[PDB]
Symmetry: C2
């Protein structure tokens, strides 16, 4: 009855937003193993833009989150069927926004949402001054 | 064989520093229940200085950390013997720096260290500009 869930991301400067999302994947089903994939530095740098924390930093933070059962660090940038069988992954967990159609097609796509960011906090610090 | 560990703090804008410290208390012994105490807003405001996140925000973040078993939120500002018996706490976990002598006296004080802060990160963001 144990279901393997894979949720990938950058997880840069993690915050309650990311945590609430990981909790969501973890509790998709009664019995889960949540595998998280952390994207490599150069792949983020190139495909998204700046990454603030190194792989080791972003991965070390993940291991402290109670919902996380296993980390694939680094993880490949785009998920593939090979990757799915290799890790015996049952579902992929991500936010909607379609490069994930083929997963929905296979009933293997479960969608998670967001919310609360670091940036928000500095504003509250600087709001204290004009 | 299960030992109750209490570790209190502000846990404002939690980061790997705080997490590594909580991991430390949790693994003080083979079988632990880590109880964390989150300090009230006005008590922090008054005794330490500014607190950036409300109690509910700081407490909601704690619940995501895998080492944390139980939260007392808010928690009293200074620990007492009453408080210890009431929660059947065996050890108190904190960093050295003596308002905690009476705990050392009773063999009930176990010391944890620090390390990696949010503030550090904004520097790395702004370092990108003169």
């Amino acid at each position: 009855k144990n279901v393997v869930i894979y949720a990938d991301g950058v997880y840069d400067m993690l915050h309650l937003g990311h945590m609430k999302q990981l909790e969501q994947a973890k509790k998709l089903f009664e019995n889960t193993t949540l595998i998280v994939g952390v994207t490599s530095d150069n792949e983020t740098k190139l495909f998204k833009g700046q990454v603030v924390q190194t792989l080791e930093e972003r991965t070390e933070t993940l291991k402290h989150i109670r919902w996380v059962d296993e980390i694939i660090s680094p993880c490949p940038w785009v998920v593939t069927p090979e990757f799915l069988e290799k890790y015996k992954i049952d579902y992929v967990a991500h936010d909607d926004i379609d490069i994930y159609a083929w997963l929905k097609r296979a009933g293997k796509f479960k969608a998670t949402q967001r919310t609360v960011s670091t940036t928000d906090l500095i504003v509250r610090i600087l709001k204290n001054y004009e």
